[PDB]
């Protein structure tokens, strides 16, 4: 059921490779090692269609040059940059990205998580395809801004999507009832409905034997099916905290209980997080 | 691309009826109104496959009786219970399960965003079907015998997901590498790898060295691709907080600093939440 991911590792150190081979000890991962920059650049051309994921150690000599050249040949694949070795003279960081935007950055002792990080590196690529490189997607051919008009990244994205992805069934929420799609009036009545609901949660949050959890569910339900981002929930919390803040200055004590109301935010977001986690099916 | 939802509502109040009618005024919702228990029993028993959701007012006369007869007949459908019982408290959201374990509880003043709650009832029934009910189970342990028509709740559940569902591509995570599937040794091994990653976050929090986006995204990738429950993340937090509570209680410092790290837990869960939310295949 699981497709084989082909890994191309560029490493100079003995200790770094030794961890990568150890982590990806499963026979699912095709490991191809290149112990020099020139070996990578040459393997890049001969096996450009045989690379699923890259692991580029920054501590490797002439790093940016190998990366700059790599984007020229059209080689744009999922990557995992390891460790920190910023060049001192290119004078064009940036550092928003070394290779491409959907690249992953790891530590030299965070390699026993590689199987999960390889998954992340592949999934991120599929979601942001086509991505932008600090070597080709800005210059030169041909303003603007890539030599892949038929989307060479999508020809790869489709190829990875069918092997590393499956097909499941989700509950189709009404997109016309999402917060960002609702009419302006409808949008802020729901927003007020969520503000009211949240206040109800907060006011009875430290009230035991209450409908607190039933109040949370009914808020999270509105939050989940209107596809509101977690930021809005965080924003709703603030608008009430501001209200309570001013309320406490006069006719009340200090604003210390607001710090106790951080539990309320953790509580609600946790519910919402689980509901999204529960809404993921299997292949069948 | 949205299937109609047949809603049967048992209400004997001219006020609540209008509140539901205004909330479900959309063309998607097929409203069927029964203004007595006998009428509900009559309609349900001859339209068993034509009820997608029940809206039951708990304060209705002979409520226990009607629901029980509904339950024994096998009419177990998605449901929203409105208000509380008439024995003998006033009107607020219900407290105990009155119909089945996938039911929803709403107060009489929380009917404004009823469309989102109908989605929640339907979805929760699908998730829990076949659902434990609060009658035909019978009960105090006064059972008698048949039947076992378990197909009924399953036939309905599958029928609803064939109407209230859609197909989307999802990254084929490795279920064998999920936290709940790993053997006891490898289970606690990954648990420590995540404990180390989370500690990396707590320390780098409020610096900022640091690249807090990288350190958190590193942790969230593991929690996601290992399908780690949100309860584990909180568990990791309090475990680490337990250690830090000890430190401060020895260097003579205050545990007041622990309050500020609730922000850390908010930050990580929010990130985890958006990871699941982003991965939801949307067709708009």
């Amino acid at each position: 059921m699981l497709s084989q991911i082909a890994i191309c590792i560029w490493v100079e150190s003995t200790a770094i490779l030794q961890d990568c081979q150890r982590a990806l000890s499963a026979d699912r991962y095709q490991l191809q090692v290149c112990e020099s920059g020139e070996m990578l650049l040459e393997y890049a051309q001969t096996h450009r269609d045989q690379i699923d994921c890259l692991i580029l150690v920054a501590a490797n000599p002439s790093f940016r040059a190998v990366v700059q050249q790599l984007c020229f040949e059209g080689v744009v694949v999922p990557a995992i940059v390891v460790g920190d070795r910023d060049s001192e003279d290119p004078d064009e960081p940036a550092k928003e990205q070394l290779y491409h935007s959907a690249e992953l950055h790891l530590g030299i002792h965070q390699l026993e998580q590689l199987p999960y990080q390889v998954d992340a590196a592949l999934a991120e690529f599929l979601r942001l395809a086509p991505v932008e490189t600090m070597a080709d997607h800005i210059m030169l051919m041909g303003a603007n801004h890539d030599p892949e008009l038929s989307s060479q990244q999508r020809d790869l994205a489709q190829r990875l999507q069918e092997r590393l992805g499956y097909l499941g069934v989700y509950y189709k929420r009404d997109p016309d009832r999402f917060l960002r799609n609702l009419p302006a009036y409808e949008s802020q009545k729901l927003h007020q409905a969520m503000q009211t609901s949240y206040r109800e949660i907060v006011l009875s949050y430290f009230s035991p034997n209450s409908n607190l959890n039933q109040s949370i569910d009914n808020f999270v339900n509105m939050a989940f099916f209107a596809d509101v981002p977690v930021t809005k929930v965080v924003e709703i919390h603030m608008e009430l905290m501001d209200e309570f803040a001013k309320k406490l200055r006069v006719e009340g004590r200090s604003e210390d209980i607001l710090l106790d109301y951080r539990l309320t935010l953790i509580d609600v977001i946790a519910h919402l997080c689980e509901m999204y986690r529960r809404s993921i099916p299997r292949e069948t | 691309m949205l299937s109609q939802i047949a809603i049967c509502i048992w209400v004997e109040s001219t006020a609540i009826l209008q509140d539901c009618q205004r909330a479900l005024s959309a063309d998607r919702y097929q409203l069927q109104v029964c203004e007595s228990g006998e009428m509900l029993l009559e309609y349900a028993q001859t339209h068993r496959d034509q009820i997608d959701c029940l809206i039951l007012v708990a304060a209705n006369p002979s409520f226990r009786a009607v629901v029980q007869q509904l339950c024994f007949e096998g009419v177990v459908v998605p449901a929203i219970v409105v208000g509380d019982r008439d024995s003998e408290d006033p009107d607020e959201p219900a407290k105990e399960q009155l119909y089945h374990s996938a039911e929803l509880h709403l107060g009489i003043h929380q009917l404004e965003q009823l469309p989102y709650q109908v989605d929640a009832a339907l979805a929760e029934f699908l998730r829990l079907a076949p659902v434990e009910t609060m009658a035909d189970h019978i009960m105090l342990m006064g059972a008698n015998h048949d039947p076992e028509l378990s197909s009924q709740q399953r036939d309905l559940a599958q029928r609803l997901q064939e109407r209230l569902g859609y197909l989307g591509v999802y990254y084929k995570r490795d279920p064998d590498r999920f936290l709940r599937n790993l053997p006891a040794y490898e289970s606690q091994k990954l648990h420590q790898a995540m404990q180390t990653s989370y500690r990396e976050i707590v320390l780098s929090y409020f610096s900022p060295n640091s690249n807090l986006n990288q350190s958190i995204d590193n942790f969230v990738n593991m929690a996601f691709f290992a399908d780690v429950p949100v309860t584990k993340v909180v568990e990791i937090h309090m475990e680490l907080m337990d250690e830090f509570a000890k430190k401060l209680r020895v260097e003579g410092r205050s545990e007041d600093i622990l309050l500020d790290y609730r922000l850390t837990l908010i930050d990580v869960i929010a990130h985890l939440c958006e990871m699941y939310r982003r991965s939801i295949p949307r067709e708009t």
Binding site: E124, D242, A245 | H271, E274
Partner: peptide, 20 residues
């Protein structure tokens, strides 16, 4: 005030994380 300020920093990364 301060609570609003520290809740805003949590929003900040969601705006500019590893996503669009």
């Amino acid at each position: 005030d301060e609570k609003s300020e520290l809740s805003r920093i949590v929003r900040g990364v969601q705006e500019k994380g590893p996503e669009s």
